[model samples]
Target chain A: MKENEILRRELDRMRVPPLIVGTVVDKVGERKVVVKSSTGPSFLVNVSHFVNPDDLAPGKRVCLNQQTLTVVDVLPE
Target chain B: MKENEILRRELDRMRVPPLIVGTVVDKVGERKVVVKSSTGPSFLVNVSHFVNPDDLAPGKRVCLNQQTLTVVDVLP
Candidate 1:
């Protein structure tokens, strides 16, 4: 447990904000889509990391990293 | 813009999951702390990038990168 903490700190030092919950506005390709957040500024995201690819489609809600725009979690409709 | 999208793709081909909201369980030093998330697993994090250092204390909520455990936003 203590060792895990040390490794966690030693790995990467970069930081970004929490996942921005948003709706998929468009599908750009087999692996990419545009997502619009409620706050402001939509983003082009790569959904290759999505746990379930079937869940991705226009109007579907998702959780994504703001800095990387990586789809983290796809919410159920 | 189209250029920004291309640039975004080019800059970081690597991707990690979103930030995990957690509470600072302990302060290891002036720049390091231990955080416990609601889902699971506590982590050791460096708070050097914190927008406001004063906001960090045991029991303070923070948004942190899961893979890196870097403190992103020190919450109110």
Candidate 2:
């Protein structure tokens, strides 16, 4: 997992709070944002509070926050 | 992608059919519920059908079909 440290640091530099990076797998609904992280943990975001006017389509980098600041870093495949 | 279309229109405007908004994430266990909109992704919401018990904890943000509506909106 040490190799991931580089990417982890890259994420950390985002200056976003509680930075969490993931890939846009899909969208379950209007209020939900689906993301598959690098570590193999899929997560859903409630846009009701963190609403964003972006595509959020499959493969979009995003940021997130749990009860606060959570962010995602979109990258090329 | 032009797919998003105007925030894809609010959920209220949908015809309630196979409009295809997006997909879900995580939910590997008990339906993960968390989102990372504006770009990235992160989710896991099962809730056995949008179960909003009023005490939804971490990774819990209601569901799609939602056995019911969400009180978060404060709408209607």
Candidate 3:
């Protein structure tokens, strides 16, 4: 039982969740933008971090965190 | 050099990519099914292996291999 504890902790942190694709429908002021997710719902996602505001425009592709729905990167057209 | 090669092989083999969600639109004949993916494309995916045929229905959700488009599991 004890032998698996160290490996268990290592596995817990190393498991990275997958990202989902979201399309930008409309660009709002600042870091906020309306994103249409593959799940068929649109969200006003935040993008204050590494994503540049210039890259966000109508019909632009972007990746979002699975559960968080945060903008990770603006994908190429 | 050999030391790095061993770890490189290990890394390549162990990197299991990720599963994407797909919804079943229509149940085709046998194990073949029409799956609606999150990405805007519907693929006629196969589900013969571990996935149960009874579990598949219209509007049912399933996870698929990113490139292979195989039905890995019937999700809730």
Candidate 4:
């Protein structure tokens, strides 16, 4: 690859990453839900555009962004 | 910097980020404690060598790695 192209690709790949898991315990409103985090505490966090709101329910496990605590993924039954 | 060197540096910046706040709830052992994280969960995590183990106590805040949940730094 050309030096400039390779440099661009490397920059593209470099944006920081990280995530963790949490479980849904209850749905309280249109945008927020209660979750018991895998780490230990419970939080009433917002549902993100990435997840289907209809998919979440009590006992469902969801992926949470450690920084924002936003619910991202809704797990299977 | 050389072509490869610059690319390597850029990729290094992209790997991942953040750290989050967690409260020390209780110390279960010398190396482990229960921390209530800002993200809404509590974790029993290991204290990293980066911080003074003696400094942690219930209710004090600390830094935690998002991926590992390890206690990395003690906060004021």
Q: Which candidate's DockQ is highest?
A: 4
Q: State the TM-score of candidate 3 restricted to chain B.
A: 0.74
In model 2 chain A, the worst 10-residue window by lDDT is: A66-75
Native contact fraction, candidates in order: 0.07, 0.00, 0.02, 0.15
lDDT per residue, candidate 3, B1-76, as tens digits? 4544554443332233435667899888788899888667889988858888788999977767766787777653
lDDT of 1: 0.62
Arrange candidates, best TM-score first: 4, 3, 1, 2
Please name the candidate that would achieve the greatest TM-score relative to the true structure. 4
Model 1: per-residue lDDT, tens digit, A1-77?
55444433422222233667888776666666666665454445567433466677779988766566566677766
Clashes in model 3: which pairs? none
Please give, for residues A1-77, the per-residue lDDT of candidate 3 as tens digits. 44355434433333244767889876655766667787775555566344787899888898876654566677777
Q: Chain B TM-score for each model?
A: 0.65, 0.21, 0.74, 0.75
Interface DockQ of candidate 1: 0.04
RMSD of each: 14.5, 15.5, 12.8, 10.5
Sort by DockQ, best first: 4, 2, 1, 3
Error of 4 at B60 (Å): 2.9
Weakest ten-residue segment in model 4 chain B by summed lDDT: B10-19
Maximum-lDDT candidate:
4
- Candidate order, lDDT descending: 4, 3, 1, 2
* Runs with alpha carbons beyond 4 Å of true place in candidate 1: A1-17, B1-76
- DockQ-based class of model 3: incorrect
- Scored against the true structure, residue A55 in model 4 reaches a CA lDDT of 84
Winner on DockQ between 1 and 3 is 1
